Amino acid sequence: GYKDNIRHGVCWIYYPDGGSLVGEVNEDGEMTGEKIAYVYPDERTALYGKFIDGEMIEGKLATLMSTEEGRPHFELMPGNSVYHFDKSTSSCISTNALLPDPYESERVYVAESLISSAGEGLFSKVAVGPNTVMSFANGVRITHQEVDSRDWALNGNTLSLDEETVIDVPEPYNHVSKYCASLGHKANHSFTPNCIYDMFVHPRFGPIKCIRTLRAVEADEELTVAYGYDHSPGPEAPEWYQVELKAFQATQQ
């Protein structure tokens, strides 16, 4: 049946975040087969294998080595690292809490923050340019009502996803020894940040957010983001943030 026509070609479908699905689609235009891949935004790191309508059933870590006539040419990495679609629930953060994301692992690490009295922070492993996705913010999915109706002490890393859902990394998963599948919850706040939270559609985590650089960042530079609490609902925010906001407003004046 092989012929030079669309039915025998390959398709790439991009998310606005720059990740993509690639492969030969079936008769209904679906990303279904044994040789489908998700390609991360570096256009190099890939999860290649069995997908059904774009959902990763068994993706093996690979490197996109070249494209020929639009067709991706992958090399599988050693180790038998496999991944699957595993969107969190209200009560389960991951079925592999200790299995790191391979793209994130090459780009960030956790260490003591340079910000005083601020615990751990997130650092770049290597020099990167502007607009680079560095890290993923995954967590359990709970309601705004639950979050808004409980103490700030429990809301240290709650991250709004949309009007219906908040992502949380509750104790003890805020410790790397118990959860390290994603690390975006380790980035500290700055009113002068070098990164932003941005939407991301992840093949393992599903629809989440990521940390993306605004500008070039050096190796070993701390990654910071604006937490974006409501300043005028004074602010509804932790005391440390309220103090820093006053200091920030003072510098602007």
């Binding site: 705004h144 908040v166 957010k209 409501d230």
Partner: peptide, 8 residues
């Protein structure tokens, strides 16, 4: 809201 990055 007691969470980061909500659109207000």
């Amino acid at each position: 809201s007691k969470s980061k990055d909500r659109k207000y």
